[PDB]
Amino acid sequence: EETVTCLQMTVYHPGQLQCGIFQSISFNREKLPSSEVVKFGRNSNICHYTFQDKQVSRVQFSLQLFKKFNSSVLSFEIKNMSKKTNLIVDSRELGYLNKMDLPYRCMVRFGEYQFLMEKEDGESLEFFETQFILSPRSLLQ
């Protein structure tokens, strides 16, 4: 047992309050193993995090950890998975199955969703924890 990387993502969607968009999401720390691939989707099957939205692709994007070559800590990689809608990460649009390495902090966006992500490094390499946080107000401007 040692310090663990934490990825914290703050979400906003306008009208998150209406049809239980975020109904299926836990807003508590979760610990996960590095081996896992985290998916985000409209499909209760095969997603850790599920959005009850007609407009979010059945699977929307996924995270995946690794470590850089000369680095002693874990980093995240985000891949898009939606033919329909592009994933914008800090102004760069990712098409279907495009992927990239995540900055320590970034805005990930798609449709009217907004995710603000922020990583804090840990010692550990076999587990990481993720935490969801809710934003009252839009994270732009």
């Binding site: 409209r42 499909n43 209760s44 007609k54 407009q55 059945r58 939606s82 329909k84």
Partner: peptide, 12 residues
């Protein structure tokens, strides 16, 4: 009626 998890993705 519509089946939710499996439906097509809707744009709008």
């Amino acid at each position: 009626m519509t089946s939710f998890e499996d439906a097509d993705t809707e744009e709008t």
